[PDB]
Amino acid sequence: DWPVYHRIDGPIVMIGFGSIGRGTLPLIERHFAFDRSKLVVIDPSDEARKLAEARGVRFIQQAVTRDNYRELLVPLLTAGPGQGFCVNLSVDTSSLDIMELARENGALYIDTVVEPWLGFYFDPDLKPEARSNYALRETVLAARRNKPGGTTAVSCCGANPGMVSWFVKQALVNLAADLGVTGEEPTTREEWARLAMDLGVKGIHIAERDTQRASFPKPFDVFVNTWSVEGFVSEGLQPAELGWGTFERWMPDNARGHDSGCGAGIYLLQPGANTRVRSWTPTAMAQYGFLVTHNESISIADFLTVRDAAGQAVYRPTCHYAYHPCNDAVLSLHEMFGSGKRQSDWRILDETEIVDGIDELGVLLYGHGKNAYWYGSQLSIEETRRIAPDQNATGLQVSSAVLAGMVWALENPNAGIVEADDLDFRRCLEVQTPYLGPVVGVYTDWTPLAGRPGLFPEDIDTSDPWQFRNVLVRD
Amino acid sequence: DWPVYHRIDGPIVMIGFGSIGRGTLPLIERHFAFDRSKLVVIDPSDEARKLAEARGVRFIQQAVTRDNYRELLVPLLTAGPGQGFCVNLSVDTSSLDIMELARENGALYIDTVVEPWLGFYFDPDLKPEARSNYALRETVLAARRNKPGGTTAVSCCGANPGMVSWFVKQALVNLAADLGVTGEEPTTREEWARLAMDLGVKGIHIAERDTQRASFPKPFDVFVNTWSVEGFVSEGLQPAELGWGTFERWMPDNARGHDSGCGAGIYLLQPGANTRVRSWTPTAMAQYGFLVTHNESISIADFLTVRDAAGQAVYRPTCHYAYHPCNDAVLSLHEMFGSGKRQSDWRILDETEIVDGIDELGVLLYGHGKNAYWYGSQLSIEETRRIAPDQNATGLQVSSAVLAGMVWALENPNAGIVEADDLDFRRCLEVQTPYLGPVVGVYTDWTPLAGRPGLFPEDIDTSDPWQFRNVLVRD
Numbered sequence A, B: 001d002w003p004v005y006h007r008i009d010g011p012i013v014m015i016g017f018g019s020i021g022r023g024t025l026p027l028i029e030r031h032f033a034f035d036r037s038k039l040v041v042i043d044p045s046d047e048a049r050k051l052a053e054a055r056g057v058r059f060i061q062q063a064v065t066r067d068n069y070r071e072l073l074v075p076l077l078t079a080g081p082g083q084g085f086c087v088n089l090s091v092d093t094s095s096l097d098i099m100e101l102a103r104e105n106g107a108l109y110i111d112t113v114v115e116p117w118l119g120f121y122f123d124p125d126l127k128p129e130a131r132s133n134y135a136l137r138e139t140v141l142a143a144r145r146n147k148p149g150g151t152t153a154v155s156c157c158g159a160n161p162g163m164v165s166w167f168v169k170q171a172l173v174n175l176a177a178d179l180g181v182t183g184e185e186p187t188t189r190e191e192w193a194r195l196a197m198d199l200g201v202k203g204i205h206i207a208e209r210d211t212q213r214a215s216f217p218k219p220f221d222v223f224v225n226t227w228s229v230e231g232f233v234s235e236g237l238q239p240a241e242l243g244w245g246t247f248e249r250w251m252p253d254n255a256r257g258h259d260s261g262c263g264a265g266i267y268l269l270q271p272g273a274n275t276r277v278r279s280w281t282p283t284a285m286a287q288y289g290f291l292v293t294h295n296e297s298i299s300i301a302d303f304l305t306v307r308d309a310a311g312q313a314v315y316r317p318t319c320h321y322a323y324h325p326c327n328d329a330v331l332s333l334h335e336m337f338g339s340g341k342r343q344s345d346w347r348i349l350d351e352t353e354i355v356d357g358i359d360e361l362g363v364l365l366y367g368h369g370k371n372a373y374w375y376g377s378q379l380s381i382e383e384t385r386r387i388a389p390d391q392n393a394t395g396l397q398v399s400s401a402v403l404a405g406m407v408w409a410l411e412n413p414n415a416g417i418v419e420a421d422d423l424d425f426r427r428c429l430e431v432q433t434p435y436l437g438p439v440v441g442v443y444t445d446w447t448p449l450a451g452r453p454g455l456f457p458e459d460i461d462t463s464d465p466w467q468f469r470n471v472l473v474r475d
């Protein structure tokens, strides 16, 4: 039957029971051993309560707030007998504060985003940099520096951020192998970074194309997506952000750097979900992606940084999201930005509504000798329905990643605060791959300068096709 | 009991039998007296032939080219017994040359676009300026100066260009009534221009929202539209163009003017269908439109120009398209520009495939004492099917405009080369209105500054809400 990877010897506290929580619960029940009364879900939504009740799980209908999270979570996470697991799959809660709470009390932790307490994302009195994922991530890195070691807490371990970090490692190994480069795999951050440098990887797109669609057309004045609408709009309205490669010779006028932190990123003074980049996936071939800020855009570029003895970065790949969401979400963005306000209503397409499609999600490594290499999942809604309940393909890539992170955390429970880039990528993918559908590596000769210049003057660098100058849409 | 307006006692030569030809023929049959054998349809496609044969109409399966159009069309236009009518609804043919040919042979002429011979729109040797609708229109104006008066030829008399010119006049009349401006209704171009100036009309959007959708979702790698795909893509890849108002205080860096001609327009060095503008319609409320070049953008601005004794323009409204096509077309544009090439295939949604929706098409007059006024048609597909065969709502707005133009031409056959702006707008709308569904005027307090600036610094002009600086979306 299904593998049972581990016994959880304590409370399992799932915060949030939206599209991801709903998809993750069945995997937790499937793959871990524990008494049913150990698991409890926390979510303020009536919709969520009704679904939870239907699934026969304990449910606390409460919003976790700055004011109550200590009083609520400390007792639940320390119920016993042994180590509990905080599975944080929420919006509007502080990943940092909850993470630190769990660690203080010896509870394992995992989430899929560095979320802030409600009132951050759309605070007009915060400058764009202060609303950046770069900034949010730095609070986690600072927490790690302040308290090294201790109980394992896994930050940003969903599909992307999360799984894609493992894909990058696998892709690097595949590229090397395809070039006839043999020998031991890297085992340290420094060795991974040097592998990327040595193979001449100039940059990386998180290259995604979601082709899922419903039996009904997009309703007017309704934002439609295959996962969190609130979450997508939140990051969509954050500044465009990207890990910034050492090979880049140009940046936009409204690009800005950071005075502090790991040094791996820049941001643009414009919303990422209204910023387009030229990208590519196997099924989409050439496409527009949206340059939506994402944790991995920074974490991957940071991870793969090579520094000299003075500590100056000598190599680093460009890294960023190039997101083509489902067609109804594309229309939803057009509608939202076109009106200058969020729609009156929203909905997440679920399994019962989606007629066909895949969530093609992978990493596009470019600039090396074989030009460009896409590695990732082509999971279809059809396969999803066969192998996991209560979610679509988008949800399953995420929930299975949380599963992998949980297994890893349980197996490595004294590793301290860790990112997806810190995990054993082979073990994680071993656990996750049964839920990822086709996992393939594809080379292409496409570049951002394909068919260019066109009928109008363009600001392009023909000496280096993958320069951000050629990727960013400026029309 | 449909009205039969006039007898056409000469040959009726329809060039092109696509979506508009198919919608227009039955209106010609319905509203004109003539012997059915004197109608001839010319179109190179097999699809066209089979539709024409099904209607028992004489058909010539030939592409009209610069090499054959004289020897092909002259005998058809002059067949007698009386004055013929060339109804040009084609692509890839020269409106100018065919128009001049008709005029030379005493035949009436009408079309819906200043189309060039095949090889013009995507000619890499042409400068962007030469590819502009401004330039193409100047060839018609030059033809009129060279041969003033004579047989009537109606240039660009579809829905837009065409009908919307009449909408502008009606809107100006309504606005004057609502604003308490007293006087005789204008009866010359000078008086119309003066009225617009006196009412304080800063600019005009051709503000359109097409909500038609089919029983099937958009297919991958197929461009979908509700009218000509070839036609729409052609103008979509022409430079963005607009009639340029005297009130404008700013233009983008890649804006350019013209050294000669009527002087009413500028163009941008970027494709119009990948240029977004902030606009508004009654059903859409605030929306993105695409700044696709259109003849009326220049012709309306030119028509409403006030000049001093020296010949300098002292008033002129901004005028341009703000097009939100059907959702499948929005997706098609995203797909096309995203891949950097036209889709492998295309289809026009017809009356058998469309489930619901309207083509909300009107003119948005702004800058005056009541901020903004939208006047136009909200024709639905349901209403369309009730009153006209073989076309969707988009097609009927066009075909009925051609009908009106044809009635006008027959009633004024010695008026020379004329634009929609030169026609008796009341007579034309009298003929067209039965086919336009609700025709309404709607005020709004919305402006392009509404809700701005947001979370990011924006390059706006807070002093004058309707400045192009605020309307244009700047990637």
Ligand SMILES: NC(=O)C1=CN([C@@H]2O[C@H](COP(=O)(O)OP(=O)(O)OC[C@H]3O[C@@H](n4cnc5c(N)ncnc54)[C@H](O)[C@@H]3O)[C@@H](O)[C@H]2O)C=CC1
Pocket: A015, A016, A017, A018, A019, A020, A021, A042, A043, A044, A045, A048, A062, A063, A064, A065, A089, A090, A091, A092, A093, A112, A113, A115, A156, A157, A158, A159, A160, A161, A162, A227, A228, A229, A230, A231, A232, A348, A398
């Ligand atoms: N890294 C990745 O690949 C992905 C990450 N995510 C993230 O995971 C989180 C969940 O995503 P979805 O389940 O799709 O979102 P969703 O919008 O479907 O559900 C979010 C849930 O959080 C609940 N919630 C709101 N305020 C709360 C509070 N104060 N305390 C507890 N719960 C609260 C809501 O009631 C809702 O049920 C989001 O933060 C999202 O950004 C989502 C998908 C992919």
Ligand SMILES: NC(=O)c1ccc[n+]([C@@H]2O[C@H](COP(=O)([O-])OP(=O)(O)OC[C@H]3O[C@@H](n4cnc5c(N)ncnc54)[C@H](O)[C@@H]3O)[C@@H](O)[C@H]2O)c1
Pocket: B015, B016, B017, B018, B019, B020, B021, B042, B043, B044, B045, B048, B062, B063, B064, B065, B089, B090, B091, B092, B093, B112, B113, B115, B156, B157, B158, B159, B160, B161, B162, B227, B228, B229, B230, B231, B232, B348, B398
């Ligand atoms: N002003 C307006 O409101 C308006 C709106 C819609 C379309 N139009 C214009 O009307 C024209 C027709 O639109 P449509 O939707 O019917 O287009 P369509 O693409 O459906 O049909 C065009 C037809 O032209 C024919 N054709 C191609 N080359 C030809 C040639 N050399 N000689 C004769 N025929 C040829 C094709 O076979 C096709 O049947 C286009 O130029 C379009 O831009 C104007």
Ligand SMILES: NCCCCNCCCCN
Pocket: A112, A113, A158, A159, A160, A161, A208, A227, A231, A235, A294, A359, A361, A394, A397, A398
């Ligand atoms: N803040 C959440 C962002 C991470 C992406 N989340 C959802 C997955 C959608 C794309 N697979």
